[PDB]
Subunit: 331 residues, 3 copies
C-alpha cells in the first residue's frame, strides 16, 4: 500500500486507541461520531492525531508503536479537548495553531513517562494528554486575549437538588452519553456510535464501557451531584475508561477481575468528583486525570490469588485474545 | 484462639500502628482515649479499621501484614478524620456509609504505593490515608448536600497576635494535645493516654513523640502562627509522627540519628504550615501529608558516616529492638 | 591552600553552578552582578550558598560533589529568591534567619531526590530549591506577621494589550534580562555580566542561554502575555535554563540536539506560563519549576537515532568537553 494510505491507517487506529481498541473500522466509526456531534471538534481532533503521529515519526519512535496507533491516541484527545474548552466558539481557525504545537508535545511526554513507567511494567495511558491539555488550559486561561477558555470556578453555593424531578430516562441515557464523553462529545447518537465501534472490535470492551459508565453515574448520584452533570455524561467517562482498562485488557478477564474493574470504576468516579472540585480552583477541568490515577493505582495492586493476573504489556491486545493467551500459557 | 478474637487482635494492633507501635494493649489504650475524647469519632474510627482489615483479607493480602495491623492503621485514620471534618455534627449515622467505602480504598492504595516504593526499600506510611481522605473531602466539600465538610478557607487578613497574652501553661499543654492530634483528638487527657500507650510498648517512641510535638510547637511559634492553632495541637502532629519515624524506628537510634529526627520534625512542622496554607485553597486540611513527605525525604537521604544507618524494612520492629539487632549484626 | 580558601572556592563554584558552569571566575563575575543589581540580595544569596555547603559538609556528603559546587548552587537560589519575595524591603536582617534554615534543607532534598533519580540516571537540577522556596513562601505567605511575602494573585481581568505600543528595543533587551532573571535579577547590566561569565567557561552555554531566553520571549508573545512581564524577563529564565540543560550539556551537542533544546525551551516557556497561572492561586511564583519539569521530560525521552545521545551523568562536564569525549569514545 502507498505510504499515505499507511499513515491514514495509523491515524485511524490512533483515533480509536483512546477507547483501547486497535481497529481501523472502529476508528472510522469514531471519526463519523465526532463529525456527527460537531464538525469543528472533529477537524481539531484529526489535526491533533495527524500532528502527534508526525511528531512520533520525526522523533524516530518505534515503528510498531506508531503503526498500532499508540501515538495518535493522545493527539486526538488534545485537539478535541482544546476545541471543546475554547471560548471563541466554532471554526476559530487560529485555534489550530496551538492544536498542532501541543500535539507535538504528546509523543515526547509519551516517551518520557514510558521511561518512568517501564520499571514497573506500567502503562502510561492518556497521561500525556492530561499533562499537555492542563498545560495549555492553564497557560491560556479564561482571561486570555488570543485563545480564551471557558470559565470553570469552584462551587460556592449549596446546590438545589429536587429528587422528585429526577428523570430516569435521561439518567439511563447518561450511559451512552457517558461513553461519548470520553472524546468530549455529549450527543447520545455519538455515544451509541462509540458503543457500536467498541462492539465491532471486542464485545467485552463494550460491556465494560457500559458498566463503567453506569457505575460512574451511580457513584455520582451517591454524593448528590447535580443532575445536569449526570445527564451531560460528565460524571462517567473516567469511570468507563477505568472499567475498560482494568476489566479484561490489562488484567486477564475473570469474575474476580470483573469485580476489581467495577471497584476501579467506582474509585475513578469518586476521584473524578474530587479532581473536578479541586482543579476547578485553577479553572481547569478533570480531563482523564481520574482514569489515569485510578487505573495506575489498580494496576500496581499486588494480590496473592492467581485469578487476578496482570499481563505483561508486551502481550496485551484485547480482552478476548488476552484470555485466550492466558489459557494457552497456563496449559 | 477463635478467629473472631484473632480479628479483633488485628484491629487492636492496627489502631495503634498509627503511632508506630504493634501492641494490643496500646491499641486498647488508644481506643479508650478516642472514646474519652468523642464516642462518635471512636465508632467511626473502629468501623474504618474493621473495614480496612476486612478489605485486606478480601484482597488476599499478606497474612503477616494483616496480623501485624499494617492494614488497619489507615482505616482508623480515615474514619476518624472523616468524622472530624463532618459538618452534620455527632452521630450522623449516614456518615458511616462513606467511612466504610473509603476504608476499602486504604488497602488498595497501601498495596499500590508498596509496589512503587519497594524499589527504594521505602515505607508507605499513612500515605494512603492522606490520598483517601483528600479524595473524600474534595469530592464532598463544604457545599455538599449529603456529607458536607467543615469550611476551611485561605487566610485573607493579617493575624492579630498579642505576644503579651501568650500562655506558657497552655503552650506546654500543647505537647500532649499535639500527640493526641495524630488521631484528630484535641483533648489533653486523650493525649496523655496516647503517651502512656506509647510508653507501654517502647519508651523511645514516647520520648521521640514528645520531642516531635514540642519541636512542632516551637517551629510554629517562629513563623508567628496564631496561638489558637498551637494550643489546639494542630501544629505538632506531623512533627511528632516524623520524629517517631526517623528517631529510632526506621533508623538505628543514635545521637546523630536523634539530631536527624529533630531536624525532620522541624522540617515536617514547616512543611505542615506550608501545606495548611496551600491545601486550604481547595478547602482541604493538611492530614499527615507533611509527615509522609518529610519522612520520605529524610529516609531517602544518603549519608556517608556509619552512625546514620537505615534499617531494611524487613527488620524494623521498634527502636530498642532495632538497636539490639544492629549491635548483634555488627558484632 | 588553606581550608578557608578551599571553602570559598567551593562557594564560588556553587554560585555559578546555577547556570551549569563550574568555574570560580564565572562565580566571581556572577557575584559581582548580584551586587550590581542589589547588594541585599547578594548578601542573602551568599549566606544561602555558605549554609548549604556547610550543611553538605555536616551531613557528610561526597567531597567531590561539594568541591564541584553541586551543593552550593541551591542555597544561592534559595537565599536570592527568599530575599526577592520579601515584603519588608531591603536589609531586613531577620530574613537571614530563615535564609539559613531553609538553606540547610537544600542538601537534604538534593540527596533525597538523588536516591529517587539515580534509578534513571536522571539529574536533580534546582529541584530542591523549588521545593524549599515553595515550602517557605507557602508557610509564610503575604499575610505573615514576621516574614511577609509579596502578593501574587491569579489574573481576574482580561489584559489590556496595545500591539502598537510594543517596543522592539526593550523586547530585544529582554534577552539579557531573561538571562539575569535566573538568579532573580532584572537589571540589564547584571544580565550582560551573566552572559560574559557564561562565555568565559564555555561559549556554547552562552549561545544556548541567549537562544533559550529569546525563545521564552517569543513563546510568551504567542499567548498574548502582557508586555510588562516580557520586558521584565519573567518569561524567559526557565526557557534559558532548559535550553542550556538540553543544548549540549546533558546531551551531546548536535543539530538534532540543538533543535531538541529549542523545543525544550519552548515547552519550558509554555509550562512556565501554565505554572505561573496555576501557582499564583496559592500566591506562589513559578520558581524554576518549569525548567525542572521540562528538562526532566526531555531527558527521559527515548529516541532511536544515534545523533540524540544522552551522556551518563558521571561524564557530563561542559558541552565542548562533552562533544570531545563523545567523539573520543566513538572512535
Ligand atoms: C490504550 O492504551 C494502551 C492499549 C494497549 C497497550 C498494550 C498499551 C497502552 S498504553 O496505555 O501503555 N499507551 C502507550 C503509549 C505509547 C507506546 Cl510506544 C505504547 N507501547 C509501545 C509497545 C508496547 S506498549 O507499552 O504497548 C503504549
Ligand atoms: C507504621 O508504619 C510502619 C511501621 C513498621 C514497618 C516495618 C513498616 C511501616 S509502613 O510505613 O511501611 N506501612 C505498611 C503498610 C502495609 C504493609 Cl503490607 C507493610 N509491610 C508488610 C511487611 C513488610 S512492611 O513493609 O513492614 C507496611
Ligand atoms: C547544574 O546541575 C548539574 C550540572 C552538571 C552535572 C554533572 C549534574 C547536575 S545536577 O542537576 O544533577 N545537580 C546535582 C546536585 C547534587 C550532586 Cl551530588 C550532583 N552530582 C554528584 C556527582 C555526580 S552528579 O550527579 O553530577 C548533581
Amino acid at each position: 500500500k502507498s505510504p499515505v494510505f499507511q499513515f491514514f491507517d495509523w491515524v485511524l487506529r490512533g483515533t480509536s486507541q483512546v477507547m483501547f481498541v486497535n481497529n481501523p473500522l472502529s476508528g472510522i466509526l469514531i471519526i463519523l461520531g465526532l463529525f456527527i456531534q460537531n464538525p469543528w471538534w472533529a477537524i481539531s481532533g484529526c489535526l491533533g492525531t495527524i500532528m502527534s503521529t508526525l511528531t512520533a515519526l520525526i522523533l524516530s519512535q518505534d515503528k510498531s508503536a506508531i503503526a498500532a496507533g499508540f501515538h495518535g491516541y493522545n493527539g486526538v484527545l488534545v485537539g478535541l479537548l482544546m476545541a471543546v474548552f475554547s471560548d471563541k466558539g466554532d471554526y476559530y481557525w487560529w485555534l489550530l495553531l496551538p492544536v498542532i504545537i501541543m500535539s507535538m508535545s504528546c509523543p515526547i511526554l509519551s516517551s518520557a513517562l514510558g521511561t518512568i513507567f517501564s520499571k514497573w511494567d506500567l502503562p502510561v495511558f492518556t497521561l500525556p494528554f492530561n499533562i499537555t491539555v492542563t498545560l495549555y488550559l492553564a497557560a491560556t486561561g479564561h482571561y486570555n486575549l488570543f485563545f480564551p477558555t471557558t470559565l470553570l470556578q469552584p462551587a460556592s453555593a449549596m446546590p438545589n437538588i429536587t429528587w422528585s424531578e429526577v428523570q430516569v430516562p435521561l439518567l439511563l441515557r447518561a450511559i451512552p452519553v457517558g461513553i461519548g464523553q470520553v472524546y468530549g462529545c455529549d450527543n447520545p447518537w455519538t455515544g451509541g456510535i462509540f458503543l457500536i465501534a467498541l462492539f465491532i472490535s471486542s464485545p467485552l470492551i463494550c460491556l465494560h464501557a457500559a458498566i463503567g459508565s453506569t457505575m460512574g453515574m451511580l457513584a455520582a448520584l451517591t454524593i448528590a451531584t447535580p443532575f445536569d452533570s449526570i445527564y451531560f455524561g460528565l460524571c462517567g467517562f473516567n469511570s468507563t475508561l477505568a472499567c475498560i482498562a482494568i476489566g479484561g485488557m490489562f488484567y486477564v478477564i475473570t469474575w474476580q477481575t470483573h469485580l476489581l474493574a467495577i471497584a476501579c470504576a467506582l474509585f475513578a468516579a469518586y476521584l473524578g468528583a474530587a479532581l473536578a472540585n479541586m482543579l476547578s480552583v485553577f479553572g481547569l477541568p478533570p480531563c482523564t486525570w481520574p482514569f489515569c490515577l485510578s487505573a495506575l493505582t489498580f494496576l500496581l495492586l499486588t494480590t496473592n490469588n492467581p485469578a487476578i493476573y496482570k499481563l505483561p504489556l508486551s502481550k496485551v491486545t484485547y480482552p478476548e485474545a488476552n484470555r485466550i493467551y492466558y489459557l494457552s500459557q497456563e496449559r
